[PDB]
């Protein structure tokens, strides 16, 4: 599997000040790199995709660069909504991994949170007001506190095709239900280390950049 690490992962910085994040990969990534801004109630939206482009919205004063192994993700004026922790992710082998993180500081429905006993299992949900559910991938993004997401898997609403993150195979299963525009995602047998927040994103046009998010949904073991 393919790694990626930001080297920083943590920077304070001032209001227009210039801040460029790193992001290297263990091996070619043939420019098929995200970055992902994650606010700190949470929300996360795709902001650059395959390397350089900005997603509609974005304002100029982001860009990004990169080739082969190494990338970078720069604000040229840092303003205060630029608050939040920034994640790079690679699109060039599955299963889609992502970068530890850089938190910047100033010097989809889914269901509700739940509290499980170890051992139990939980199916959340994510419903899609989206009319291109059951044409699109709705992906699943594991956040544990401070570390790398990591991505689940992934199913096709249109005829139930999945792919896994093999290390997930064994503790997750996703299904979705055209009628009701709703996937879900079943997770076995709790440990401590399963408590996290789980994330359903969407993908379509770019299989491997997640354009649309839902809000997470807060998983916790007793």
């Known amino acids: 599997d393919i790694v990626l690490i930001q080297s920083t992962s943590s920077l304070s910085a001032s209001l227009g000040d210039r801040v460029t994040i790193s992001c290297r990969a263990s091996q070619d990534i043939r420019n098929y790199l995200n970055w992902y801004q994650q606010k700190p109630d949470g929300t996360v939206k795709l902001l650059i995709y395959?390397?350089?482009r900005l997603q509609s919205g974005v304002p100029s004063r982001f860009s990004g660069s990169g080739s082969g192994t190494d990338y970078s993700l720069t604000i040229s004026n840092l303003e205060q909504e630029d608050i939040g922790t920034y994640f790079c992710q690679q699109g060039n082998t599955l299963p889609w991994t992502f970068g530890g993180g850089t938190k910047l500081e100033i010097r989809l429905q889914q269901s509700g949170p739940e509290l499980v006993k170890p051992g139990a299992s939980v199916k959340i949900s994510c419903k899609d007001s989206?009319?291109?559910?059951?044409?699109?991938?709705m992906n699943w993004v594991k956040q544990r506190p401070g570390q790398g997401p990591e991505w689940i898997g992934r199913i096709y609403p249109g005829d139930g095709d999945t792919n896994y993150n093999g290390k997930f195979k064994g503790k997750a299963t996703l299904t979705a239900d055209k009628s009701s525009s709703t996937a879900y995602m079943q997770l076995s047998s709790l440990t401590s280390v399963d408590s996290a927040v789980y994330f359903c994103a969407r993908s379509g046009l770019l299989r491997y950049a997640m354009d649309y998010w839902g809000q997470g949904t807060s998983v916790t073991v007793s």
């Open positions: 989206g009319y291109a559910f059951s044409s699109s991938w």
């Open positions: 395959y390397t350089s």
